[PDB]
């Protein structure tokens, strides 16, 4: 599974219940609030598969926002199990 599919997966499964999925803009704003700069065009490139191979710092920033380890992006075994746990927590929320 590519980075973009995994990131889109997080957008679809980790969000405030009785709100809905975060917008890309909300993520950029949340990152900005923590001293982290990410352009709107770059986030769209990452989500659309136009830019692959994000840096460690980027994956970490996105992982922190979604409250997950970045190993979600880089470890197949881990991704598959955690995605399932997140899905379940999503219904629980």
Curated annotation (Swiss-Prot):
Subcellular location(s) of the protein: Cytoplasm, Nucleoid
The entry's DNA-binding region: 36-48
Keyword entries, A-Z: Activator, Cytoplasm, DNA-binding, Repressor, Transcription, Transcription regulation, Virulence
Primary location recorded for the protein, binned into one broad class: cytoplasm
GO cellular component, one term: nucleoid
Record-level Gene Ontology MF annotations: DNA binding
Transmembrane intervals: none
Function: Virulence regulator that has both architectural and regulatory roles. Impacts cell wall functions and pathogenesis through regulation of multiple genes.
Subunit structure: Homodimer. Binds DNA as a dimer of dimers.
Record's protein name: Nucleoid-associated protein EspR
Species of origin: Mycobacterium tuberculosis (strain CDC 1551 / Oshkosh)
Lineage of the organism: Bacteria, Bacillati, Actinomycetota, Actinomycetes, Mycobacteriales
Gene: espR
Residues of the full protein shown: 3 to 95 of 132
């Amino acid at each position: 599974t590519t980075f973009a599919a995994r990131l889109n997966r997080l957008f679809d499964t980790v969000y405030p219940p009785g709100r809905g999925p975060h917008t890309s803009a909300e993520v950029i704003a949340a990152l900005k609030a923590e001293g982290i700069t990410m352009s709107a065009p770059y986030l769209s490139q990452l989500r659309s598969g136009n830019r692959t191979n994000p840096s460690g710092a980027t994956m970490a920033a996105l992982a922190n926002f979604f409250r997950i380890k970045a190993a979600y992006f880089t470890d197949d075994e881990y991704y598959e199990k955690l995605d399932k746990e997140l899905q379940w927590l999503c219904t629980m929320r």
